Design a protein around this motif. Structure first.
Motif, PDB file in Angstrom:
ATOM      1  N   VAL A 219      14.156  33.275  59.456  1.00 28.71           N
ATOM      2  CA  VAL A 219      15.032  33.246  58.292  1.00 28.71           C
ATOM      3  C   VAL A 219      16.391  32.708  58.731  1.00 28.71           C
ATOM      4  O   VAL A 219      16.849  32.993  59.843  1.00 28.71           O
ATOM      5  CB  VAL A 219      15.141  34.647  57.644  1.00 28.71           C
ATOM      6  N   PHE A 220      16.999  31.872  57.893  1.00 30.00           N
ATOM      7  CA  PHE A 220      18.350  31.398  58.149  1.00 30.00           C
ATOM      8  C   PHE A 220      19.382  32.391  57.657  1.00 30.00           C
ATOM      9  O   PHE A 220      19.234  32.984  56.585  1.00 30.00           O
ATOM     10  CB  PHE A 220      18.593  30.039  57.506  1.00 30.00           C
ATOM     11  N   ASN A 221      20.423  32.561  58.451  1.00 25.90           N
ATOM     12  CA  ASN A 221      21.553  33.397  58.111  1.00 25.90           C
ATOM     13  C   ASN A 221      22.803  32.643  58.517  1.00 25.90           C
ATOM     14  O   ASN A 221      22.749  31.739  59.353  1.00 25.90           O
ATOM     15  CB  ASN A 221      21.467  34.747  58.826  1.00 25.90           C
ATOM     16  N   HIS A 222      23.916  32.986  57.894  1.00 25.61           N
ATOM     17  CA  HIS A 222      25.186  32.455  58.336  1.00 25.61           C
ATOM     18  C   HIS A 222      25.707  33.275  59.505  1.00 25.61           C
ATOM     19  O   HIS A 222      25.176  34.335  59.843  1.00 25.61           O
ATOM     20  CB  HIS A 222      26.196  32.490  57.199  1.00 25.61           C
TER      21      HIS A 222
ATOM     22  N   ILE B  13      16.233  35.967  63.302  1.00 24.53           N
ATOM     23  CA  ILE B  13      17.372  35.622  62.468  1.00 24.53           C
ATOM     24  C   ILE B  13      18.270  34.671  63.242  1.00 24.53           C
ATOM     25  O   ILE B  13      18.698  34.974  64.361  1.00 24.53           O
ATOM     26  CB  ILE B  13      18.141  36.882  62.047  1.00 24.53           C
TER      27      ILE B  13
HETATM   28  C1  LIG Z   1      23.170  37.630  57.795  1.00 19.55           C
HETATM   29  O1  LIG Z   1      24.013  38.173  58.771  1.00 19.55           O
HETATM   30  C2  LIG Z   1      24.863  39.212  58.263  1.00 19.55           C
HETATM   31  C3  LIG Z   1      25.777  39.614  59.392  1.00 19.55           C
HETATM   32  O2  LIG Z   1      25.036  40.113  60.496  1.00 19.55           O
HETATM   33  C4  LIG Z   1      24.025  40.375  57.739  1.00 19.55           C
HETATM   34  O3  LIG Z   1      24.923  41.286  57.119  1.00 19.55           O
HETATM   35  C5  LIG Z   1      24.443  42.637  57.116  1.00 19.55           C
HETATM   36  O4  LIG Z   1      23.708  42.881  55.928  1.00 19.55           O
HETATM   37  C6  LIG Z   1      23.196  44.212  55.801  1.00 19.55           C
HETATM   38  C7  LIG Z   1      22.376  44.243  54.534  1.00 19.55           C
HETATM   39  O5  LIG Z   1      23.179  44.570  53.409  1.00 19.55           O
HETATM   40  C8  LIG Z   1      24.353  45.204  55.782  1.00 19.55           C
HETATM   41  O6  LIG Z   1      23.831  46.527  55.723  1.00 19.55           O
HETATM   42  C9  LIG Z   1      24.629  47.320  54.817  1.00 19.55           C
HETATM   43  O7  LIG Z   1      25.217  48.418  55.503  1.00 19.55           O
HETATM   44  C10 LIG Z   1      26.093  49.210  54.685  1.00 19.55           C
HETATM   45  C11 LIG Z   1      26.728  50.265  55.569  1.00 19.55           C
HETATM   46  O8  LIG Z   1      25.694  50.918  56.293  1.00 19.55           O
HETATM   47  C12 LIG Z   1      25.278  49.823  53.537  1.00 19.55           C
HETATM   48  O9  LIG Z   1      26.153  50.530  52.676  1.00 19.55           O
HETATM   49  C13 LIG Z   1      24.544  48.725  52.749  1.00 19.55           C
HETATM   50  O10 LIG Z   1      23.724  49.318  51.755  1.00 19.55           O
HETATM   51  C14 LIG Z   1      23.727  47.821  53.670  1.00 19.55           C
HETATM   52  O11 LIG Z   1      22.664  48.612  54.171  1.00 19.55           O
HETATM   53  C15 LIG Z   1      25.201  45.027  57.033  1.00 19.55           C
HETATM   54  O12 LIG Z   1      26.357  45.854  56.960  1.00 19.55           O
HETATM   55  C16 LIG Z   1      25.642  43.575  57.182  1.00 19.55           C
HETATM   56  N1  LIG Z   1      26.373  43.396  58.426  1.00 19.55           N
HETATM   57  C17 LIG Z   1      27.309  42.459  58.593  1.00 19.55           C
HETATM   58  C18 LIG Z   1      27.965  42.418  59.942  1.00 19.55           C
HETATM   59  O13 LIG Z   1      27.610  41.673  57.701  1.00 19.55           O
HETATM   60  C19 LIG Z   1      22.998  39.875  56.729  1.00 19.55           C
HETATM   61  O14 LIG Z   1      22.074  40.907  56.403  1.00 19.55           O
HETATM   62  C20 LIG Z   1      22.217  38.697  57.298  1.00 19.55           C
HETATM   63  N2  LIG Z   1      21.310  38.158  56.300  1.00 19.55           N
HETATM   64  C21 LIG Z   1      20.265  37.388  56.613  1.00 19.55           C
HETATM   65  C22 LIG Z   1      19.430  36.916  55.462  1.00 19.55           C
HETATM   66  O15 LIG Z   1      20.007  37.086  57.772  1.00 19.55           O
END
Ligand SMILES: *[C@@H]1O[C@H](CO)[C@@H](O[C@@H]2O[C@H](CO)[C@@H](O[C@@H]3O[C@H](CO)[C@@H](O)[C@H](O)[C@@H]3O)[C@H](O)[C@H]2NC(C)=O)[C@H](O)[C@H]1NC(C)=O
Ligand SMILES: *[C@@H]1O[C@H](CO)[C@@H](O[C@@H]2O[C@H](CO)[C@@H](O[C@@H]3O[C@H](CO)[C@@H](O)[C@H](O)[C@@H]3O)[C@H](O)[C@H]2NC(C)=O)[C@H](O)[C@H]1NC(C)=O
Ligand SMILES: *[C@@H]1O[C@H](CO)[C@@H](O[C@@H]2O[C@H](CO)[C@@H](O[C@@H]3O[C@H](CO)[C@@H](O)[C@H](O)[C@@H]3O)[C@H](O)[C@H]2NC(C)=O)[C@H](O)[C@H]1NC(C)=O
Ligand SMILES: *[C@@H]1O[C@H](CO)[C@@H](O[C@@H]2O[C@H](CO)[C@@H](O)[C@H](O)[C@H]2NC(C)=O)[C@H](O)[C@H]1NC(C)=O
Ligand SMILES: *[C@@H]1O[C@H](CO)[C@@H](O[C@@H]2O[C@H](CO)[C@@H](O)[C@H](O)[C@H]2NC(C)=O)[C@H](O)[C@H]1NC(C)=O
Ligand SMILES: *[C@@H]1O[C@H](CO)[C@@H](O[C@@H]2O[C@H](CO)[C@@H](O)[C@H](O)[C@H]2NC(C)=O)[C@H](O)[C@H]1NC(C)=O
Ligand SMILES: *[C@@H]1O[C@H](CO)[C@@H](O[C@@H]2O[C@H](CO)[C@@H](O)[C@H](O)[C@H]2NC(C)=O)[C@H](O)[C@H]1NC(C)=O
Ligand SMILES: *[C@@H]1O[C@H](CO)[C@@H](O)[C@H](O)[C@H]1NC(C)=O
Ligand SMILES: *[C@@H]1O[C@H](CO)[C@@H](O)[C@H](O)[C@H]1NC(C)=O
Ligand SMILES: *[C@@H]1O[C@H](CO)[C@@H](O)[C@H](O)[C@H]1NC(C)=O
Lengths: 595, 585, 591
Positions: free
Chosen positions: C314-317, C408
């Motif tokens: 999967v692509f991510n930023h 990722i």
């Molecule tokens: C792309 O990369 C970004 C950065 O690593 C990923 O962001 C992460 O996304 C998850 C999914 O929402 C976040 O989890 C969240 O955590 C909070 C706190 O526990 C919670 O309240 C939310 O319900 C959710 O579970 C995570 O924080 C976030 N991290 C960052 C550093 O941005 C993203 O998922 C990646 N997407 C793909 C498609 O690769």
């Protein structure tokens, strides 16, 4: 004979005009040194005096005055030598502030200045007592008293370091190896063109770096009578030079005894301006008798009558612009005098078809001196704790044509000012440098008690030029380092600041460019398959496609300079075909030496 | 036959002087990833492979080794090194600032808290800092003005020391390029201008550590067993008097001071390290040293001094006042600036137990010579605890009136050039001229340089002459890692520059020899024999004495000192003849 | 028998060594009066016709992560930019706060800013309007009227040098003598392992300085099967390099007619900025051919799932990090470009038209390497277009553990070095030195086909092919660009330039090799021809090689390299035994 097996020749006394970096010479600067601050302005290696000078009398050559490249480097060198001087020197940066000034009478042009300067961290100087000239300020706000600072819009805050001295040195000049300067021993022969009596010179005479306007301070005499040098094609619209047979010194006077007065400015910042003068100042003058100058003016018209059928000879004074060009810059004593010469050409010359034996001229030295070729970076000099009577013999002149037509036979000579280049052309108008290709190649012959000239073999008897080839090389390229043989590491290799010089880095560039010729020649000698032989008879016969002359006539009077340009159609041609056959020799025995 | 038939002797062991900058060498175990941080030299980038030398004793010659050309390079070289490291360092803008100083808890003359007032570089905030600085390096006026001006701010600029670089003196083997010999003397007792029987040539020096001296020689090499001056000095009392020393003396000198560092920013990229608070004790730097050994030395001194002064009565007096640094002893261990008042050391008089020396430190150092260059001391935490070896002294004939015992020495601090002269008196650098022709009367691995007639010893120096640029032999520079260490970082242009400048001299000297080889049609073979007659206008002497009674040195000295034309004369004899065999064959 | 030694001067000894880099310009087709410091205002013109020789039989590992020549060249451009900025001026008085307004709306992008100053020494105060971005101004005190430059509080700041530009000239890196450049004409070569189909060329092809981040343009297309590169696939913290056989152009331009204002600082300083605007402005948008961008991503996951199958990529930023890294840095003709890559990686591509690029422009450029200095970019009058082909990409792999097992990926960048690694996959420069001996049982055509010829044969043709190599050793005009002696007269210039330093560097070492070669010609073999240089003494008791001529009939020069570990001293033992004959031939001539 018709065997015609063409045979190479190494060390042939020939030359081609080429332009390569120069070289200097400083036996006299190595003979004495009070302090190396002039050596800081003028650094050069000695040259082991009584040099060899050889006459080549039997070959004339076209000398090209006004257009030699040796002009171009030596002017751009010295500006860079002026650059290294100004690199450690401080920049008078806050100085374009306003000035309150009151004029001082002893004349009427000297003016003191005091103003609300913030010069240091502390100490707001207001009792500033700084004496200046009229010529060194721009009058601004004429009703008020602002009156300041000629050129502070541009980057002129450079100033002279006081420990550095400016007294010029006679500097001889040499060449890197593989190059020889040609010297015409004819006498004052033209302004452009060839000359018969010539000679080679390794290292020229000494030249003091001296720049003056319309005037030749500490110059070089003319052993003939008076002569002129011109281009004489755009003669109507081009400033030319004048050379004088004899000379006159001019003792030029002293204002009064003076004081330096260091003013606290900052870190290394403490420049100088006069606050005190011992006594009452007398007007600066350059003292000379008219009668000798009265003699010279007649001698001019003699040269004028050689050029002009019977034109009238008139001397007005030049126009108001370019004031440093109008007056005469006397840089003696490290001090930049300027003197009014309107008392010189009140007389225009009477076509012939003591009331004032002596004459002193009104003078004003300036304290700020600008770079001429561009706008920015003027040079400031501090005052002296004294008063200087310098004198210099005057050997030449620079004049305009002032072209036009007004009364049909009456033309005027307003005086003619120039750049620094034409100052330096004049002494170099007997010197041209060429390179050396030692290699030559000519087809075979029939059968398989003095020091000689370097080029007298090419001078005369080019057929009998078959000898002395080696010693023609042993001074010119061979002895890669002929300057101070053993390569004397001396007061240049000693005591050099920063090890990053204009000279030594070019000298590093010099000796490397020496050998890569010689080794690359000897590479090519190995490519020709023979080294350590002056000649190598080679295995192609001379095809007569190239020339049709007889064998004896070529060993009769055929100049190398003739013979090189006859064969210049087949330069790489006569190269490639024999070396590949020499390579055809290389594919013969190499397969044979396998077994 | 009886005619002089000259024939080339290439590689004859003749030496003659030439001034020339030379190579350096250092240990491969010394650098510890900090070529720059140890000292400005980059720890002398070319390595020191091997000390493999030979000693060359046939005869003695007075090589008048007092006056010396090596030093003038080196003292120029060191100043080239000190601005080199200080050029990327940054200037000081708050030069001549008031800085009202106060001392904490009254010892006097020490560090003063000076309450550093400043407005910063380009921003516009008048700040106040804690300026903790000596009484010595600062100057107030008028005893009521607290105008504690900086001592050199009116003179010139001052710059921080780029404090990653330390100040350790490295034992460096100052080597030489090709065709060069470093003369030395294993014979003892030669005083500057002297001859030397047990004499030798080396290619590199030993590991010299040139650092710091006012009047004393520190961490220097020992002398012979007799504590005897080995310099030449004229009998004018203004001539400076060095002396060597046998017995190495070792002195404990230290800091009772556990300062901290503090950084003060002024401008962009301009944070300035200053002295922080001192942990614990504040006592003066001192120097414990046994005076009984100093008593033992001084007795051993004056006997040799009475021996060279026809039993004069020598009394040492304390030196005159003057400069702070010439008089008081700037000695620098750990890269700090100890100044020691030697008023305990010359309360001494002659006719027929742990002394401790009170010392002090100043921060800011000028050149004594060029007044535009000043260096600032960076603060280093902890307490400096170090020592030295002591093996020499420098004094001066004072010059009082003869109602005394007619000898007073009042000491003197001097020029730096002395300090390299202090050891190189046993050294001399000479150049080698493998060229040579002798008349040979025929019509066409022991040691390098000795003898009167070379059986094959000239060929031994040809092997040294074929140490020229082999690229692989470890002896020259090995030109393998030496060829690669320079090409990586030649942009420094301070140290590798002379090396490549040495390459320049290495080739064209050899190449001109390669020319004059092929110029006379010699082409190797060491002989190059010609059937050219030469008159006995130069020598009506027996040829046999020229063989063996005399060497080729003094024979070159005698008649060859002027016959340089014979080179041209043997050239044309070749040049005409080669054309003849060309023209006849 | 066999004498156990003969000298054999010309023998191809490829040998890894690092010397000083050498290169030439091809401004011969350009001849621009504008200096453009990369162009060096034409250091030295190139060869029109070089020759290229492929050596088929050789295989050799070439690590494309242990190159010296990358960081050396990386050091060069750093030093090149030093001689750019050190002439012209630094913005020393221009480091002061300023009050700024937004021109219209966008929505706070373009910022007309004002400040009291005296860049003159003539003691006046006035407000100076100047036009800026949001991208370069730090806000102070709850984003009120107080503002400053983001940079200059740490680093030092200069103005870029106005008369020149920022265009890359393809140039031919090359070699003076001895050492030479290698190429491997096989494909899928990640940078590890050996490879076949190996060539050697004297110089390189024309190579332009790559400078952009996250983007690879105007570079190596390499039209075979799509390949991918990275250092260590065990570690997630490695940069993942993309090669693409196809070249997507992308047109990008100035959406604004603009003018120049030149604020006079003082004597010869005279700061340059933008004068005005004609109309309204956009965000310099670009086009990608989304359907080709649809196509490209289909191609790459093939080889990716060829490396790791069933990994649902999967692509991510990237995360919010450094603006050099997180944004597409880009230059083309002057100014700088910063376009959002967020519109690429909403795509996933697990199993089976046009585009918009909002783009940004940083005026100030801080130090890429560490902190030290910073650069201001003055603008350019009028609109500027740029369309350029894309050849490759740089990426990274995330490290968070998935129980879905997804790999990722997010944007990787932030190293100027790897732009040089991007091209030098094929390229290695080894020293070639002509020396090598062989015990030969003797009585006692391809051009530059060095290692295609065998140490097994060491043939008579292999002798003459090193005669070709010693034809390379001598230099005159057009055999050698340094010994192109016409330029040597043209080279009157100062050599304080880094390139001029390279000149005086490379020339003398080429000579003293060729000298040190020629020093060892006579003293070893006493002959001009390489074969007849022979040595008698039978190295059997100390050469100690259990082989034969019939073994030598199937051998190689690496055997002779293994002989060098054992017999390096024996050459010196040969040479003193070589000295033994002429010291006995001397006494024949002595008495
Ligand atoms: C792309 O990369 C970004 C950065 O690593 C990923 O962001 C992460 O996304 C998850 C999914 O929402 C976040 O989890 C969240 O955590 C909070 C706190 O526990 C919670 O309240 C939310 O319900 C959710 O579970 C995570 O924080 C976030 N991290 C960052 C550093 O941005 C993203 O998922 C990646 N997407 C793909 C498609 O690769
Ligand atoms: C040197 O020669 C030039 C010309 O050959 C002389 O310049 C002439 O100076 C006079 C005096 O000012 C000018 O006369 C005035 O000219 C104006 C404008 O033409 C006119 O309106 C007045 O009524 C008056 O006649 C004359 O024009 C001017 N000629 C030129 C060509 O500029 C100069 O005076 C001579 N030097 C000396 C010392 O006499
Ligand atoms: C790259 O491709 C895009 C298309 O994706 C181009 O953008 C298009 O540009 C045209 C002309 O600039 C726009 O048409 C204009 O629309 C406005 C509003 O209706 C109208 O007033 C104008 O007269 C003109 O008709 C079009 O809307 C726009 N569309 C998009 C999606 O951007 C872009 O110009 C191309 N750039 C290059 C360098 O080829
Ligand atoms: C130039 O003018 C200044 C000020 O008008 C003179 O400086 C004064 O000198 C006298 C004694 O020489 C002092 O008593 C005054 O205090 C000075 N002025 C100030 C403001 O301190 C200076 O003497 C004049 N010099 C010349 C050559 O005219
Ligand atoms: C031609 O130049 C030669 C020098 O190249 C001049 O030779 C000098 O002539 C005078 C008169 O015979 C002698 O006093 C000098 O000693 C000669 N010099 C040397 C080097 O022998 C000769 O004067 C020149 N002729 C012209 C007309 O100037
Ligand atoms: C033998 O030696 C004498 C003394 O060196 C030579 O005399 C010189 O001869 C040249 C001319 O060839 C004169 O110019 C010198 O002035 C002479 N020298 C002296 C000191 O008077 C003599 O020439 C030599 N003989 C031969 C045949 O070369
Ligand atoms: C981006 O803009 C460039 C610039 O015009 C386009 O290139 C043009 O393409 C058309 C159609 O292929 C040609 O007719 C023109 O000759 C091209 N001109 C130039 C200067 O390249 C390119 O097609 C555009 N691409 C996208 C995706 O917008
Ligand atoms: C020598 O050359 C000159 C120049 O042409 C010529 O006049 C003369 O006749 C030639 N000598 C002979 C003997 O022909
Ligand atoms: C005088 O010197 C001699 C040696 O020359 C020595 O034996 C004697 O001790 C000396 N006397 C003095 C007072 O030192
Ligand atoms: C390898 O060498 C052999 C000759 O020994 C040749 O036939 C073969 O084509 C070569 N293979 C390649 C191209 O590497």
């Amino acid at each position: 004979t018709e065997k015609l097996w063409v045979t190479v020749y190494y060390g042939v006394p020939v030359w081609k005009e080429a332009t390569t970096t120069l070289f200097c010479a400083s036996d006299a600067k190595a003979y004495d040194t009070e302090v190396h601050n002039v050596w800081a302005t003028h650094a050069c290696v000695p040259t082991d005096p009584n040099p060899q000078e050889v006459v080549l009398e039997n070959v004339t050559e076209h000398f090209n005055m006004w257009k030699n490249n040796m002009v171009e480097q030596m002017q751009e060198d010295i500006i860079s030598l002026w650059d290294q001087s100004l690199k450690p020197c401080v920049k008078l940066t806050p100085l374009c502030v306003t000035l309150n000034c009151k004029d001082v009478n002893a004349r009427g042009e000297i003016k003191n200045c005091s103003f609300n300067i913030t010069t240091s961290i502390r100490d707001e100087v207001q009792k500033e007592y700084a004496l200046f000239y009229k010529l060194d300020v721009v009058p601004i706000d004429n009703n008020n008293t602002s009156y300041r600072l000629i050129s502070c819009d541009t980057s002129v805050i450079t100033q002279a370091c006081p420990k550095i001295s400016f007294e010029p040195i006679p500097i001889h000049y040499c060449a890197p190896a593989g190059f020889a300067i040609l010297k015409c021993n004819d006498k004052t022969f033209n302004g452009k063109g060839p000359c018969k009596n010539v000679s080679t010179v390794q290292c020229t005479h000494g030249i003091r770096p001296v720049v003056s306007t319309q005037l030749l301070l500490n110059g070089s005499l003319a052993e003939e009578e008076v002569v002129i040098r011109s281009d004489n094609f755009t003669n109507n619209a081009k400033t030319i030079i004048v050379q004088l047979k004899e000379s006159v010194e001019i003792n030029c006077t002293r204002p009064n005894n003076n004081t330096r007065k260091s003013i606290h400015i900052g870190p290394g910042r403490a420049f100088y301006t006069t606050g005190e003068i011992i006594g009452d100042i007398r007007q600066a003058h350059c003292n000379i008798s008219r009668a000798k100058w009265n003699d010279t003016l007649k001698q001019i018209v003699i040269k004028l009558r050689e050029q002009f059928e019977n034109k009238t000879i008139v001397f007005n004074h030049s126009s108001g612009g370019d004031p440093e060009i109008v007056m005469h810059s006397f840089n003696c004593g490290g001090e930049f005098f300027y003197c009014n010469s309107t008392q010189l050409f009140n007389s225009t010359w009477n076509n012939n078809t003591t009331e004032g034996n002596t004459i002193t001229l009104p003078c004003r030295i300036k304290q700020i001196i600008n770079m001429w070729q561009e706008v920015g970076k003027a040079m400031y000099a501090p005052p002296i704790r004294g008063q200087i009577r310098c004198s210099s013999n005057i050997t030449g002149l620079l004049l305009t044509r002032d072209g036009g037509i007004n009364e049909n036979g009456t033309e005027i000579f307003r005086p003619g000012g120039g750049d620094m280049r034409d100052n330096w052309r004049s002494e170099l108008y007997k010197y041209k440098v060429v390179k050396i290709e030692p290699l030559g190649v000519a087809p075979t012959k029939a059968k398989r008690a003095v020091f000689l000239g370097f080029l007298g073999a090419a001078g005369s008897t080019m057929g009998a030029a078959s000898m002395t080839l080696t010693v023609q090389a042993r001074l010119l390229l061979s002895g890669i380092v002929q300057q101070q043989n053993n390569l004397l590491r001396a007061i240049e290799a000693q005591q050099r600041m920063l090890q990053l010089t204009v000279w030594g880095i070019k000298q590093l560039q010099a000796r490397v460019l020496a050998v890569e010729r010689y080794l690359g020649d000897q590479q090519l000698l190995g490519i020709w398959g023979c080294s350590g032989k002056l000649i190598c008879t080679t295995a192609v016969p001379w095809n007569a496609s190239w020339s049709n002359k007889s064998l004896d006539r070529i060993w009769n009077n055929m100049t190398w300079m003739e013979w090189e340009r006859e064969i210049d159609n087949y330069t790489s041609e006569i190269y490639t075909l024999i070396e590949e056959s020499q390579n055809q020799q290389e594919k013969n025995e190499q397969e044979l030496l396998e077994l």
